Amino acid sequence: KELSFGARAELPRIHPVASKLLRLMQKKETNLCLSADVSLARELLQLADALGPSICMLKTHVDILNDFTLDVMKELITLAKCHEFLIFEDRKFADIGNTVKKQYEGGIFKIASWADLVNAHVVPGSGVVKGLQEVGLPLHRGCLLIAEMSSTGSLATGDYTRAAVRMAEEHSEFVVGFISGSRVSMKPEFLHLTPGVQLEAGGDNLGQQYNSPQEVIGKRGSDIIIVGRGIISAADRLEAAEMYRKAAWEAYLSRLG
């Protein structure tokens, strides 16, 4: 029988980052991750502040920010602490271990310095995780492995997905879960986060495909919905975030039944 988020926060094998997340999800009654796909720091921070109470997590693509600075990320950390949500940089590390270690720690973005969570493609083999984990371990960071993708023609299926799950199990001191379309692991210490989510049926013009929060949380067994345009494109982003939060939260409650 399915454990609540609060109970999963207490699992013996739980990573500290996953535990903090699960605790705030339970506290705030939200399993919504905002995909803050904007190009302006001011818009990012205004959404983070207004929607902070409604979300468990804010997912960034800082490489799309036109006016990125480390001071912007400092302000984002302040809002994340104030409102209690994790920061997830959707960087999709996908290179050899020696390279991703530098991409995570260094350069202009210094992603490890501010992101609670990052993600990696499993295509390079487990060196991708080993390289990241050397940086993320003393910083008490976590990583999500990309086990499935939402887009048309995704090759992250079958044995590929299985390889991601095995890699996660073998690196559970750093890997806290998955980007996937459905539950892919039966181990409850792993988080499942699912993008390609909208209330309405459809897709976009570049291969994105959508499923509803009820389908993804309720039937497919995932934990958190990641929602970009379904919220960002609304006139009132707060009302939209609330619609998504209630959808995902009630689907989760249903599944506990």
Add this chain to the structure above:
Amino acid sequence: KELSFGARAELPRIHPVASKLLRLMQKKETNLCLSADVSLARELLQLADALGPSICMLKTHVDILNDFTLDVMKELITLAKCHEFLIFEDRKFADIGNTVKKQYEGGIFKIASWADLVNAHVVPGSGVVKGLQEVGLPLHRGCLLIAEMSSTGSLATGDYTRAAVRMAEEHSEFVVGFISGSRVSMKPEFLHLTPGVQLEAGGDNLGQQYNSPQEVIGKRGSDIIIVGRGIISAADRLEAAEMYRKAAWEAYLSRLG
């Protein structure tokens, strides 16, 4: 029958960026791409200028430069034009089409403004290419698809590699070739670039595996070697670049008969 780089430069279906590359390869007798894996702009520029005459291409990870600015890029372009080599940003785009479009055109790096070539993982499905091409085609750029990887445990094998080749075939207005360990396409319009290259047998401590220039160019039929540490860690980077250039060039000549 195998064609020279100079003849391949003239093929009817050749992409203009591949043609430019192939002509300078022939002209300079170099099929060496320097992997300029450094953390400082000064070093990137110093190596680009010193090794420029020995290389057909300089591969960047701009996200590992502690002091990236667009002015550094502007200088790098000046060197590329002076010495005649292409700039290849090894960004490994690997997200949905709508996202990579932004990551290629925008943010702080403005990658499409300066990179002749970029690369993409094929795992998201062909939307990754469609998104990139919306930015890359107007800017007269090319893309390489990652068909194989050099690292231990790579999942880019078998049907995954075949999928990469099909996707390239089908997007030949923008995709000019592959990152691969061997020749994966029989079509001579496509370039094959191979990383994981050193003169000696070995690897690194995070899953890199090395093969020699003779093995990669001569036996495995690839076109260009990509070499980082084999050159940059050497005491004499000029001599090292020349050894790799001579090795790759004579392996090509031999294969050619």
